[PDB]
Structure formats: structure tokens, C-alpha cells
């Protein structure tokens, strides 16, 4: 839902 979560799974 947002690119700024990086590599957070999901």
C-alpha cells in the first residue's frame, strides 16, 4: 500500500 514501507513483508 505504500512504497515507503521498503521491504516490510506485504
Residue numbers in the entry: 1 to 10
How is this structure described in the published paper?
Triptorelin is a decapeptide with uncharged N- and C-termini pE1–H2–W3–S4–Y5–(D)W6–L7–R8–P9–G10–NH2 that contains three aromatic side chains (Y5, W3 and W6), and three ionizable residues, R8 and Y5 (pKa>10) and a histidine, H2 (pKa=6.1 in water). In this letter, we report on a decapeptide that self-assembles into either 50 nm diameter nanotubes at high pH or 10.7 nm diameter nanotubes at low pH. The peptide conformation switches from a globular one at pH>7.5 to an extended one at pH<6.5.
By optimizing the crystallization conditions large single crystals diffracting up to 0.85 Å resolution were obtained. The high-pH crystal structure obtained at 0.85 Å resolution reveals a histidine-serine H-bond and histidine-aromatic interactions, whereas the low-pH molecular structure demonstrates these key interactions have disappeared, likely in favour of cation-π proximities. Hence, the 25-Å-thick bilayer observed in the crystal structure (fully compatible with the 26 Å determined by SAXS) is essentially maintained by aromatic stacking, as shown by the side view of the bilayer and in agreement with the low β-sheet content observed by ATR-FTIR. The histidine tautomer in the crystal and in the nanotubes is the τ tautomer. Remarkably, the histidine residue is part of a hydrophobic aromatic cluster and its orientation is locked by two strong hydrogen bonds with the S4OH group and the backbone amine at distances (nitrogen to proton) of 2.1 and 2.21 Å, respectively. Finally, in agreement with both ATR-FTIR and Raman data, almost no direct intra- or inter-molecular hydrogen bonds stabilize the peptide conformation or the peptide packing except within the type II′ β-turn induced by the (D)W6. At high pH, the monocationic peptide with a single-positive charge on R8 is coiled at the level of the five contiguous residues H2–W3–S4–Y5–(D)W6 with five intramolecular interactions among them (right). At high pH, H2 is involved in an intramolecular interaction network, that is, two strong H-bond H2–S4 and π– π interactions between H2 and Y5 (intra- and inter-molecularly) and between H2 and W3.
